[model samples]
Target: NSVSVDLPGSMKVLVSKSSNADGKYDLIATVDALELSGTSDKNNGSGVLEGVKADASKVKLTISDDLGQTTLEVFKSDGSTLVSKKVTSKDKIIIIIKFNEKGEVSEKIITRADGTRLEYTGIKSDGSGKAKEVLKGYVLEGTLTAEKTTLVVKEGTVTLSKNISKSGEVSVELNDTDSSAATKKTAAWNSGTSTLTITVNSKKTKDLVFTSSNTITVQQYDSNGTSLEGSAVEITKLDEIKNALK
Candidate 1:
């Protein structure tokens, strides 16, 4: 499941399972980290999907930012996660999940970065620092059922262009930085409990979590619960995941 995409400024993404690379990928989980340079905002979210043949735990993604432009890439770093320097973009890090002999990714390392962190999504980032999201390309079998899933944006704010009208599935709106008219929007999920919590700030770290387990639970609120802008477009067909990302 090698994947790559030229992400525009602020347009962060999170690829999900059933939300295959085609189907309105709503199946959310989580991934370690993929930083965007200018996005020092509150919405620091992340996600994943994969292929290729490296030990998932040994691989790392880097947003190789230089020359005023950013390119995504990955490499086998020194037995550790390639710490996101914040410049953003790597050598088109293809999300290749290394499934063990069992074929299930719950035990062995699945793909790049952190394995236990299993969700990678994309989101928008202001030049501030906080991130709204990153790629949650959970492309395993194109579908993962879970008991609970959560997406959050902490420091920076999610400025919606119009009323957030999610279609058959959800897609990331990272590049929509100009408009901040709506404070909240409506979202729909298939069968499981999907949560969206975007708490915009200029100080905290924004993050999103996607769990494929029915045993996990995420309670993200003190009293002022944020709006739910949960998403990740799930494209269809095994190759569609490739075509879309390609």
Candidate 2:
């Protein structure tokens, strides 16, 4: 299934699973009803559909923003969830999951960047920098798993780019677990839990702890000290993590 909507300055294409009973779908173009003629808002909120895929058990859909971000969500007929994701920048983010004949997810591809388009791999665990694709039509080879830090940096790329904090910086904390070593690091969100424990291999565990004294926010000015309006700004959290490691 395909949907097209006209917005103030751009258009969006919404693709959901088809109902042909076959694994393929045909594309269609139409005017969108959600966006107004001109404004800063573009998203029409969220969308829903039932049995959109041909198999009813497995279906694929694509959501693209001609300008800011594009996301694709794949789900079960009943909307229980298999794997849903957004790829705002690597040109496209692809997810591959296996669903049972019943439409339930059995395996998932999580998400991957379209390095084939010559973009950066999300980033890394330590925050050094994202891998450069450099060349168009080069295509990414093999699988790449971006660090959670990368996910934080690529949040806008996935769907929406909202500031989690007023300071323009997001808070990072580790999930709680029962490991004594983990407890020693004090990984709480607001308790100044600065220590980070990283496992290099099955037998090696490294501890790192650091926090930014200032706030994290987007750069408001350009090289000439002028405010930039529509330029793309990225945080690259993976690089931050790498700095912590060092």
Candidate 3:
């Protein structure tokens, strides 16, 4: 016998069973499939349904931002799982998005995830619409533009510019570790926290400013130094850096 039901969007499920012997029948196989072809014209929008596949109760979907393509694959397997995921556009580079167990997007990483993969060591946001992206080697920041659909970074490069800091009785010296400029940035200690008194240096200026009132908990990294998004850090006094500057 054959059975068919019309799904909302050509979606359908098929189940078939076979018997071995001993006058008894046992469940054998089950499948869920959905496919649509040609251009769909409705309302004020139109879309072309290429194809969709699912299998083994686990439907795997791979979406690419760089390619601006999304492919869905369904494979048959003995394993069973309820899988659902939405791929974000990676065209701007290779954006890595992490989802929580509840399937909500927990965090997003925007960077060039290729051989020249670069990560943002720090980001400085002005009180206005502009911000800067800082890297490890280069303390110089790049401009961040807020587009209608996405935020684009005008300057996305940096150099390994080390910053030096030394505190003494007379004065404190916070200078570029890479440059030999004798002009030093100054700082002071107040309320059990050391704060930068001058904002002469751009990199040091942003790095020294952080709110102490808010308790921020960060995700810890793994043994390999890879940041583990799943693991969360516990709040403690040590985690609180009141006036930490370098």
Candidate 4:
């Protein structure tokens, strides 16, 4: 699978080193978000480039709206496909991507301003999958069709999942936690710049956090005599799951 396989024109693969995972390296396929520039693509719309940074500030966005349907496509600088979407109306679309240690995109969660999240593993040979409606980690419904790198949401929607402890690292992941209560915060999914606060009972003011692939990446601060000795930590405090996660 090391041989790079290109999917269509503007779609390509980036294979990262194995350090991103335990052994299975990631093959990241991306759709060029800038090269969708043609006669049929419209751009510079109202909410375009609202929260984009400088490296991608020059990235061009295209739009297609009809019958209340707007087309969303994501491509990289080399004109390779990452993912294309069919969404309803939008104010802002916040696509959150998390990378593994090898600098490979481990996962991506594309969220509409309304908290609609589309998450998938950053693994693909090509967009040769099928398209259909499905329920993701914790939600009502979604349409996930694989159309040659296309995931159509003609649809309806991680838990704390695992724990990791090594070398005096307190950056543990809570296992078998409920994602429904987790996502129950009903985040607007608006700005990745926003922070999530996990306060336990008596509600000690803690640290700040950024959102990640269907999970929250919490920064650490000392709490109740525990050093939280690492850079990150995951606490269920499942007793009061619904707090300020938006």
Candidate 5:
């Protein structure tokens, strides 16, 4: 039987087949809409899925923004979504978004502009989402719930002498790395100027160091076997290590 019916919003139809001994096609179930939509409403994002085919169970789409680009994927089985963002001057990362069977968002693992990550749960249509920054192995710097942004910082210990001196060794252990450098040997902080002179001890240094007084100075070494010298930045802030320092 065939009929014309106008439905509200978007819906899905599930088809089932019954196997008979001699017949190739047989229908034994009622035809009804599954009531599934790619998006529950029209206010989620700016794009429509448009057309989808059954060539495969998964599909990929590319979205580019002012920051850089993002690669998104959707799975038909669980309706789960994944996004990989390639932001400007930052490491390429992946974000996972989960949704329930009724096309409602249940949870999400999102990243922020300051290299911090957040975990959100109980995300409703227009509610708080009850999100928090991923804070197990990392420390929380700050949070802006309205903006859905967070700043996760790495904790470390700094050993300073009782008195402020022009010549002393400052031992700092940030994250998993340890650094102990003399003031005159590797730094020039006694002149009241915002300057840092990092002396490279080994070729295996794979970290970025920043110093600031008013403007920021970022220093890092080049990769092994590169013709260029170590990288350095002055009069500007390094986006990768900005929030962690503050």
Candidate 6:
């Protein structure tokens, strides 16, 4: 499938021709950030500018939040519709969003200035720089509605799980490993930042995700080891599983 698709309005599409299977692939638009300007229906709280670099572009997008300052990088395509953003120095945030033709987002990392990159830690963490792993690599396969959704792990494993509720909060459950045992940490989720890190035995692992339809782009990295940003997934199986049944 084509990673990047043309969008409506001033938005554009960009695919990382050199990225690996799991690295950042589809960049939403062309810009650093899209500050909200009163939530318009046409722009969908997102706008774009063309011709940034010779072969690059950028985008600007707003997020839905009621708490503190929330910044978002929108990513939309015919298949998947998603938004990755980071809310900083604030509490409980909300933002009204918009969409473009072909269902693509108006902002994404691909349009990030030529030198800018959306750094991520696939591991889960709490906002206080504390991270933990509730579910080790055991596996959590299920469906969103009727559509089949598959989550296959490529590296590491799920360590612990506790107090996890449907309220959307993933309780803290630090992994038990040689490195994790050294430091007791918890996991945190930053919806605005689109990044995640888990506090484990020794160091941390970056669990970054780039999501669209039918797939979620995951990048894993060790604290000190060379950042293996984009690795491929091994789909052990593809079947329909019940939710909350595990």
Q: Which model scores highest in lDDT?
A: 5
lDDT of 4 by residue, 109-228 (tens): 656555545455543343122222122223322222232222211101212211112221112122223346423311112234544333343333334343343344455436662344
Descending-TM-score candidate ranking = 5, 2, 3, 6, 4, 1
TM-score of structure candidate 5: 0.28
Candidate 3, residues 1-246, lDDT tens digits: the string is 322322221233221232234432221112233443322222111222333354333344332322244433332343232233333343434444443343433333344323222222222232112222222222223222222111121211211111211121111223233342333333332323332332333222322221232222334324443334354332343213222222
Q: What do the candidate models score in CA lDDT, each in turn?
A: 0.27, 0.32, 0.29, 0.33, 0.34, 0.32
Cα lDDT, model 3, residue 183: 37
Winner by TM-score between candidate 4 and candidate 2: 2
List TM-scores for all candidates, in order: 0.17, 0.24, 0.23, 0.23, 0.28, 0.23
Question: What's the CA error at residue 162 for candidate 2, in Å?
Answer: 32
Scored against the true structure, residue 205 in model 4 reaches a CA lDDT of 34
* TM match of model 6 to true structure: 0.23
lDDT score, candidate 6, position 5: 32
Q: Clash number for every model?
A: 85, 13, 13, 22, 0, 63
List the lowest-lDDT window of 10 residues for candidate 1.
Answer: 123-132
Per-residue lDDT, model 3, residue 34, is: 42
User: What would you estimate as the lDDT of candidate 3?
Assistant: 0.29
lDDT (10s digit) by residue, model 1, range 197-216: 23433211122222332111
Q: What lDDT score goes with residue 122 in model 6?
A: 24
Give the per-residue lDDT digits (tens) of candidate 6, residues 96-181. 23334434323212112222222112212221111121121223322121121122221233343322233423222233333445
lDDT at residue 67 of model 6 (Cα atoms): 19
Each prediction's RMSD over C-alphas, in Å, is 22.9, 16.4, 19.0, 20.1, 16.8, 19.0
Worst 10 residues of 5 by lDDT: 27-36
For model 2, residues 1-246, the per-residue Cα lDDT tens digits are 344543221334443344334533333322232211111122332232222444453233233334434333446567566544333433344434344445443333323342322223333343223322222222212222323211222211111111123232434443323345532222223325433333322222333333342112222223332334343223344444333332
For residues 42-161, write the lDDT of model 5, one tens digit per residue: 221212222233533343333232223434445564334422222222244345677665555666665544455556666666534554543223333332333344333342332111
